[PDB]
Symmetry: C3
Subunit: 33 residues, 3 copies
């Protein structure tokens, strides 16, 4: 139950990191227009 939480939080930490990089790419692209 705790292990289930830990795994999901780890997934979320990773997913947030990678999603932010995609947002930063968009910001770069849109900002150079």
């Amino acid at each position: 139950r705790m292990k289930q939480l830990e795994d999901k939080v780890e997934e979320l930490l990773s997913k947030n990191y990678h999603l932010e990089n995609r947002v930063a790419r968009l910001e770069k692209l849109v900002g150079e227009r």
Copy 2:
């Protein structure tokens, strides 16, 4: 419950990340990059 509150927050984050990623993917389709 302190544990229940944590599980709720995690479920919230999982939902939020799903939906936010879809919004980012949409932007990526629109930007074409």
Copy 3:
């Protein structure tokens, strides 16, 4: 458990800020 709460607060903060950045892009692209 406390370390997990800290990570979750981190995620909640990061999601909030990231969403606002996504919202700004939606206005611009939109």
